[PDB]
Amino acid sequence: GAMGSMERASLIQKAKLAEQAERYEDMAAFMKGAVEKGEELSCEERNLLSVAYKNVVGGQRAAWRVLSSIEQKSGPEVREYREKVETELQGVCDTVLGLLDSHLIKEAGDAESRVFYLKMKGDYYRYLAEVATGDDKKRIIDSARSAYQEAMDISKKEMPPTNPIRLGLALNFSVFHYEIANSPEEAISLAKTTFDEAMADLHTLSEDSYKDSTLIMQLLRDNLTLWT
């Protein structure tokens, strides 16, 4: 691969420079190369990996939604170009899921990293589900559910209810229930119990941890008040 001759630390440094330059495709490529060195990512490095690919697929998803809307309102050109963007989006999701399965998801991790990566797996299957149809959609939806559910089980056993990774997982799994799985009641129940259980334990947190936790709690509440 094009990053194979570069030092791991140089890849991480360049990922950070790419972030400053808002060059997220480059950032993702550097982080992919870093993952391929075969060492476990630190907390900071996991966040770099996630931010990079979030921004890449985010732009693709937004473009796909524009083109799909134009196509729905409506020669083969709109469909062709929507399909082009869709295929590139699916390619990025496949890349991320490949990194997770081949390098990052392990049995013998700390809870923080195991939950982080299984949540990510659920997210990227969810992005595939956004553009899938038919029975193919059904299997992709179940793959997302299974990854989220495993992450949930670990997070409830090994993390406190205020842990920001646990909270972000619950937020995205609830969004999965509402937007993908046609289960708004489950979405609302999960957001509510997650919010309430975190609320009850805020008194244990420092000022800094309190800010981290309450910022994600506020996102949960935003979705709850949108939905109800």
Partner: peptide, 7 residues
């Protein structure tokens, strides 16, 4: 769509 985690 409903918003997901922004990070």
């Amino acid at each position: 769509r409903t918003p997901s985690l922004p990070g």
